[PDB]
Design a protein around this ligand. Structure first.
Ligand SMILES: Nc1nc2c(ncn2[C@@H]2O[C@H](COP(=O)(O)OP(=O)(O)CP(=O)(O)O)[C@@H](O)[C@H]2O)c(=O)[nH]1
Ligand SMILES: Cc1[nH]c2cc(Cl)cc(Cl)c2c1CCN
Ligand SMILES: [Mg+2]
Ligand SMILES: [Mg+2]
Length: 180
């Protein structure tokens, strides 16, 4: 029944597409084909609810700011992807969260922090530093591999769950009403 708008964001090459395609098509894309923008639809059942997932897969780097602003306005939930062997991509997470909060003019935006490529031996970003970042934001953290598929379903489902909690909150939130 319910429709969720998920936006996958992150630096160049972190595996945004591979994750999405693992979720949708159940196979690992070995090729590196830079994204402009891709729109996907998946129907899953989560906690006994049929969810229509509208997933936007975004570019590592947008040439026009206005194109970034557009998906930051529309997205209900954001999957914030870094690669565990890419320190810069991890540092970029802060900037994505800030721009999203600016654009939403809001402190509460459902997000999940995703550390991808956990199958690699080339780690430069420690689980702990990533856990601590998520804890600071008040969001879930999940490590994944689009190659092995570890954590993939979980990352997306958790995001859906975060959106639900925010809707629940939003209703009762927070000083200007609100219900229950
Ligand atoms: N070992 C490993 N490789 C991965 C993983 N995810 C993606 N890759 C590889 O990294 C490269 C980039 O993957 P891709 O999913 O296209 O990244 P992207 O962030 O979507 C690229 P863009 O930002 O240009 O859209 C590909 O060669 C892909 O096979 C992973 O979990 N583990
Ligand atoms: C054009 C556009 N804007 C979006 C914003 C979100 Cl949050 C999710 C999606 Cl799937 C889209 C699409 C693709 C529509 N086919
Ligand atoms: Mg891509
Ligand atoms: Mg990007």
């Amino acid at each position: 029944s319910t429709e969720y708008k998920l936006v996958v964001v992150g630096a160049d090459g972190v595996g945004k597409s591979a994750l999405t395609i693992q979720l949708i098509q159940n196979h690992f894309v070995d090729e590196y084909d830079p994204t402009i923008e891709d729109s996907y639809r998946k129907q899953v059942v989560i906690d006994g609810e049929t969810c229509l997932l509208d997933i936007l897969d975004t570019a590592g780097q947008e040439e026009y700011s206005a194109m970034r602003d557009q998906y930051m306005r529309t997205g209900e939930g954001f999957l914030c992807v870094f690669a565990i062997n890419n320190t810069k991509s991890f540092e970029d997470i802060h900037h994505y969260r800030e721009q999203i909060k600016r654009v939403k003019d809001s402190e509460d935006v459902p997000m999940v922090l995703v550390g991808n490529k956990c199958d690699l031996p080339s780690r430069t970003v420690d689980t702990k530093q990533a856990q601590d970042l998520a804890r600071s934001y008040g969001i879930p953290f999940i490590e994944t591999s689009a190659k092995t598929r570890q954590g993939v379903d979980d990352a997306f489902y958790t995001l859906v769950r975060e959106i639900r909690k925010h809707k629940e909150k939003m209703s009762k939130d927070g000083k200007k009403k609100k219900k229950k």
